[PDB]
Design a protein around this ligand. Structure first.
Ligand SMILES: [K+]
Ligand SMILES: [K+]
Ligand SMILES: [K+]
Ligand SMILES: [K+]
Ligand SMILES: [K+]
Ligand SMILES: [K+]
Ligand SMILES: [K+]
Ligand SMILES: [K+]
Ligand SMILES: [K+]
Ligand SMILES: [K+]
Ligand SMILES: [K+]
Ligand SMILES: [Mg+2]
Ligand SMILES: [Mg+2]
Ligand SMILES: [Mg+2]
Ligand SMILES: [Mg+2]
Ligand SMILES: [Mg+2]
Ligand SMILES: [Mg+2]
Lengths: 200, 50, 147, 203, 98
RNA sequence: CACCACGAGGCGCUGUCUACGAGUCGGGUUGUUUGGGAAUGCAGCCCAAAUCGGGCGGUGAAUUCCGUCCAAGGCUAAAU
RNA sequence: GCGACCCCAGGUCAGGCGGGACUACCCGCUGAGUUUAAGCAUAUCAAUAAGCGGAGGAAAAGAAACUUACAAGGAUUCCCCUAGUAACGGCGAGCGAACCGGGAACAGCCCAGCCUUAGAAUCGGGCGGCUCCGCCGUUCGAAUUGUAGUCUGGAGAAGCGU
């Protein structure tokens, strides 16, 4: 070792040459996955190629709680609120997740509205052609039925907007930094304050 | 055995920025419009109308 | 590019540029960072002060997400406002633009630099520094806390 | 409606009744070979809850295994290596005794399939287990949808690949999460995945 | 308690209308039927108590509650299970006295 | 072309019930292993549970709460 | 002496099953030292080589006794990132994951236990038929020390309505 260089820490002391993974098959993998997707689309025709509907869920942890993404499946509470029996939802293209809990009204209401939109946009063929049942669609709707290729219900964020508002005296007399400092102090000293209150 | 036997994990490919690729494509397209350059590249264009 | 390698220029010069006396042997000073305290001590001390020893407390299973806190300076707040909103704010002095820095991925607002002259700005953020709040108040704006 | 009584009684292993019965049974087992068939399970309820059924094609074998750790089997206890590896005694087999019993039953009974096993008795020198095996060739087994999966070739010698309940236990698979993640899909598979040096085309 | 809408202090976080969790069958994991309790009582009558349970009961009869708890902790392994076992022994002793 | 809803599921209600895996979990100790650090998993030996309970919440311990799941039985295609 | 059961013994009894072979990948066990540390013993080499076994076309894993502390995610597997990071380490040489986030693919289920008792409703073998990977009839046997059916916590039983 010589000169002023960063201290090296290369992890190459084992038989690493026997565990090298190359990517010469990357185009082949892409082609194989595309072929599988095409075969699946042909198989499930006329069902949408994007797959079953998924719920809207929040991101985990403080880093992503402002983000909205797709969850595994709709909760039992959401299905009950939307009037869709849980045993029927999977058969009509709705994913079901019996594990997800509903802690707030906003998420439950959002997913219920999503399910209602899907129901409004859903067309169901009868099990037997000559027999029409409660959940089946009319012949006119069935005739104009096609396979949807892309995502039929994109999960998108409401883009930010900067509006002009009046600055009132109440806002001009608010000490944000002082509020933050006092809240931090209260959080730090809650235990001591409770102990003193209990003692006295 | 040869000295330093060749191995498959040699860096065969190159990752050129997209902007540079587009620059090169635009330059080639512009050069294709210069009759002198087209002649200089070996093409017989003495009979092309324009 | 093999044809540009300097060993090609050294073909026919015996030592290949590594000297007749010293030569190029296998590991004359040990492997890797060997001897950091004994025969490579001068190099470590002069170029890598602080390398040896330990300081501070440990933190088992430390997750970086709970420490996430992007910051933006007040001198960059105006750049978040779209051009049409900036024009509207310039035209009308009775209202101020309302910038939610959280929608742009910022948690805390710091107080480096200055704002546009004679421009009131309403800023909402999770946290703010005392200087940033003072500058916003001086500009005629206000601060709103969110989460 | 009787199995709960038996299970609760077998949870009271320090009771006088259980101590007497287990003492007599341990004496009797000591006199017989290490592997022997039993006409019916001596713990019916435990066998049921482990998948046994009272129908043709199901059998139970009692297996006796020696107790204690694994002495390193080197001549004269001599190790040619560094001091860290010089230990001979106080070394422990990575597999459990019940896994050993299941392996012995499976190797001895090559024409059957090991399903599960349970502890029955133990003394200072021996530990005893009964192994539930299935004759996959029997028509009763092959016509039962709940068990005929064992007839498929992928389940050959489950006990020798750690696929039994004891196998999953000693492979570290009975838990999930931060305390067990390195065990899935397998410890060696995880090591191979972690050590792999990925060199993409565009680096 | 609802979130304050602040990022610091007590009850911090984004403001949402909290919803009580819907009841689910898993709320009864620690409970069992009356038949199971009856069976366990009968089997306890049939099988009696283990020697260490008898030792704890003797210690409680003498009046050495701390020694009984120490013995229970040594036998079972944890202070919580030792406390539970000592309480159960005390309940059995109370039933015997009455 | 016959297409039969006895029965079984779907939905709503209930001052009733609501059964869930033991020498297993857990604990002590020893050996090994792990990034897992008053001990990550595994294993031997010793002790050895519970049902308004049990496991986990990356610093051991006691007290009071809170969050989250339900082990010790089993099967399962695809992405690799 | 007869009979019932239990445990066990002998059958070239009627009909079935198993051993062994291959190595690129896969599963379980066992297990070094060369080497690096400019010496060397912990460490490293390596949870690797060698050794002993077990499968398939993939294997293994898999439906939370999970992740987290959020406005919360939701079987397993794999890729990118996390990250040469938290941590470990004669804190030397070195070693080194996981969660979130973005993608590929997606699928959920079966049992044990209280619950036929107006009758084991279950299953195997022989024999005889049939539209023969199975169905029907008859006869022996297994099984009550429990085969079918319902139930599996996401529930469910029972009762009443649609
Ligand atoms: K340099
Ligand atoms: K040189
Ligand atoms: K020289
Ligand atoms: K520390
Ligand atoms: K060593
Ligand atoms: K149950
Ligand atoms: K269970
Ligand atoms: K132990
Ligand atoms: K708990
Ligand atoms: K028959
Ligand atoms: K059943
Ligand atoms: Mg030199
Ligand atoms: Mg050796
Ligand atoms: Mg498999
Ligand atoms: Mg980085
Ligand atoms: Mg992910
Ligand atoms: Mg027949």
């Amino acid at each position: 070792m010589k000169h002023n260089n960063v201290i090296p820490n290369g992890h190459f002391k084992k038989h690493w040459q026997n565990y090298v993974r190359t990517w010469f098959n990357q185009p082949a993998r892409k082609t194989r996955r595309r072929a599988a997707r095409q075969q699946k689309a042909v198989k499930i025709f006329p069902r949408p190629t994007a797959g079953s509907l998924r719920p809207i869920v929040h991101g985990q942890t403080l880093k992503y709680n402002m983000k909205v993404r797709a969850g595994r499946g709709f909760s039992l509470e959401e299905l009950k609120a939307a009037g869709i029996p849980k045993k029927l939802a999977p058969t009509i293209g709705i994913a079901v997740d019996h594990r997800r809990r509903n802690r707030s009204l906003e998420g439950l209401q959002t997913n219920v509205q999503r399910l209602k939109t899907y129901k409004a946009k859903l067309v169901i063929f009868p099990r037997r052609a000559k027999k029409v049942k409660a959940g089946d669609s009319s012949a006119e709707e069935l005739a104009t039925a096609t396979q949807v290729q892309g995502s039929y219900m994109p999960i998108t964020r409401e883009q930010p907007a900067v509006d002009l508002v009046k600055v009132t005296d109440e806002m001009k007399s608010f000490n944000a930094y002082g509020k933050l400092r006092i809240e931090r102090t209260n959080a730090r000293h809650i235990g001591a304050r409770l102990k003193r209150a209990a003692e006295a | 055995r040869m000295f330093a036997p060749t191995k498959i994990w040699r860096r065969w490919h190159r990752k050129i920025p997209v902007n540079q690729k587009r620059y090169a494509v635009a330059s080639a397209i512009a050069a294709s419009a210069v009759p002198s350059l087209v002649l200089a590249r070996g093409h017989r264009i003495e009979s092309v109308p324009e | 590019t093999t044809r540009f390698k300097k060993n090609r220029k050294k073909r026919g010069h015996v030592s290949a540029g590594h000297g007749r006396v010293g030569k190029h042997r296998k590991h004359p000073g040990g492997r890797g960072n060997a001897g950091g305290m004994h025969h490579h001590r001068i190099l470590f001390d002069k170029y890598h002060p602080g390398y040896f020893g330990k300081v501070g407390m440990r933190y088992f299973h430390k997750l970086r997400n709970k420490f996430h806190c992007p910051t933006i300076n007040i001198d960059n707040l105006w750049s978040l406002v779209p051009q049409e909103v900036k024009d509207k704010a310039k035209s009308s002095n009775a209202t101020a633009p309302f910038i939610d820095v959280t929608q742009y991925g910022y948690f805390k607002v710091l107080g480096k630099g200055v704002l546009p002259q004679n421009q009131a700005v309403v800023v909402k953020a999770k946290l703010i520094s005392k200087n940033a709040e003072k500058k916003i108040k001086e500009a005629g704006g206000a601060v709103v806390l969110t989460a | 409606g009787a199995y709960t009584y038996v299970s609760e009684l077998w949870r009271k292993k320090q009771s006088d009744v259980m101590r007497f019965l287990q003492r007599v049974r341990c004496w009797e087992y000591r006199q017989l070979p290490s592997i022997v068939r039993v006409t019916r399970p001596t713990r019916p309820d435990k066998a049921r809850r482990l998948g046994y059924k009272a129908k043709q094609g199901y059998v139970v074998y009692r297996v006796r295994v020696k107790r204690g750790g694994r002495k390193r089997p080197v001549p004269k206890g001599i190790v040619y290596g560094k001091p860290t590896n010089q230990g001979v005694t106080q070394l422990k087999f990575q597999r459990s005794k019940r896994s050993v019993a299941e392996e012995r039953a499976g190797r001895k009974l090559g024409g059957l399939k090991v399903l599960n096993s349970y502890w029955i008795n133990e003394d200072s020198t021996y530990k005893y287990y009964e192994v539930i095996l299935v004759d996959a060739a029997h028509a009763a087994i092959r016509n039962d949808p709940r068990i005929n999966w064992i007839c498929n070739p992928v389940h050959k010698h489950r006990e020798l690949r750690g696929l039994t309940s004891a196998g999953k236990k000693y492979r570290g698979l009975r838990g999930k999460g931060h305390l067990y993640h390195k065990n899935r899909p397998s410890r060696r598979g995880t090591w191979k995945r972690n050590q792999t040096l990925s060199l993409r085309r565009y680096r | 308690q609802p979130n304050t809408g602040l990022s610091v202090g007590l009850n911090k976080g984004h403001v949402v209308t909290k919803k009580e969790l819907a009841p689910r069958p898993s709320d009864r994991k620690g409970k069992t039927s009356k038949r199971v309790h009856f069976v366990r009582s009968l089997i306890r009558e049939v099988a009696g108590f283990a020697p260490y349970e008898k030792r704890i009961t003797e210690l409680l009869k003498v009046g050495k509650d701390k020694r009984a708890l120490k013995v229970a902790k040594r036998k079972l392994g944890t202070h919580k299970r030792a406390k539970k076992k000592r309480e159960e022994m005390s309940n059995a002793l109370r039933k015997m006295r009455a």
